[PDB]
Amino acid sequence: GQGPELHLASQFVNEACRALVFGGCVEKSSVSRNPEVPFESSAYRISASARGKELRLILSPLPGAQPQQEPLALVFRFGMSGSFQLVPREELPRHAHLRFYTAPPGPRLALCFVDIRRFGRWDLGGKWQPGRGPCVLQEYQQFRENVLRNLADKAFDRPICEALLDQRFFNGIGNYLRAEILYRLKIPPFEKARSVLEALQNPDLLELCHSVPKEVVQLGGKGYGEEDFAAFRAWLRCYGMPGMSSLQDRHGRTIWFQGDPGPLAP
DNA sequence: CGTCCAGTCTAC
DNA sequence: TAGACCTGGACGG
């Protein structure tokens, strides 16, 4: 996922788990190379928050829960095929790699981290990844200042389309978003990042890094039924669209654009 | 059947 | 900077 998908997953976990109580341990698939989650409680509530491309679950035991346990935090990155689903306990999806089980009374459900390709990860810490910059969705002002204050950094030597994926500065921006952001301003994708950003300090490029992803969030849906995908496909103006050019950036990722490739094109 | 296509993370 | 990590769907022979 990118920022909007991670944000919508966090809203999903919060709304779906709102009136649920989990009990038991946290079960991992045998094939997952991520860590076993050392957690058990007779009664715990799960809630979520998103920051850029990361999602933090908090497991919160109720008063009196046994074994005595402090709340535990987990941070997930989704990679290419991560998601959360709420399913019936005995109809787990095929790649449900981490599950939380509701306690009785009611229908035994499973909250599942589902990741087909297993590019996603989780850590026990609870900390956000050091080096990821502020969330373009929820920390706009911190995100904007973190870029403008560091334009000397070598990251800004690269083409703008490459700098937009560097999660140190654009935490939450991925491939469709970089295309859609640059198309709104008709910025050539191989314009130099420092050139485009130096021309700041008018919705501008950094503002669009917040407002474009926010548009996706306001669509709703995107896994969180299938008509939700036509909603998103209709919103797109550039990424994958007939009549648009594509190039490979230097890390082999496809950038979609209109017109001028830009000076630093391969 | 085969190939090609869809974000880190780590070794050189 | 180049390959490593994975599965599945579209599509071509």
Author numbering: 2 to 202, 222 to 244, 249 to 290
Article excerpt on this structure:
Human endonuclease VIII-like 1 (hNEIL1) is a bifunctional DNA glycosylase of the Fpg/Nei family, which catalyzes the removal of damaged bases and subsequent incision of the newly generated abasic sites.
While we also crystallized the complex structures for more lesions in this study, we were unable to obtain intact substrates in the active site of hNEIL1, presumably due to the residual glycosylase activity. Hence, we introduced an extra E3Q mutation to the truncated hNEIL1(C∆95 P2G) (see the “Methods” section) and succeeded in the determination of complex structures containing 5-hydroxyuracil (5-OHU), spiroiminodihydantoin 1 (Sp1), (S)-guanidinohydentoin (Gh), dihydrothymine (DHT) and dihydrouracil (DHU), respectively. The damaged bases are fully extruded from the DNA helix and inserted into a relatively loose binding pocket, which allows the accommodation of substrates with varying sizes and shapes. Noteworthy, across all these structures, we observed an unusually short distance (~3.0 Å) between an outwards heterocyclic nitrogen atom of the nucleobases and the terminal nitrogen atom of residue 242. Based on the similar overall conformation and detailed atomic interactions, we conclude that such a tautomerization-dependent mechanism may be a general strategy for hNEIL1 to recognize not only Tg but also 5-OHU, Sp1, Gh, DHT, and DHU.
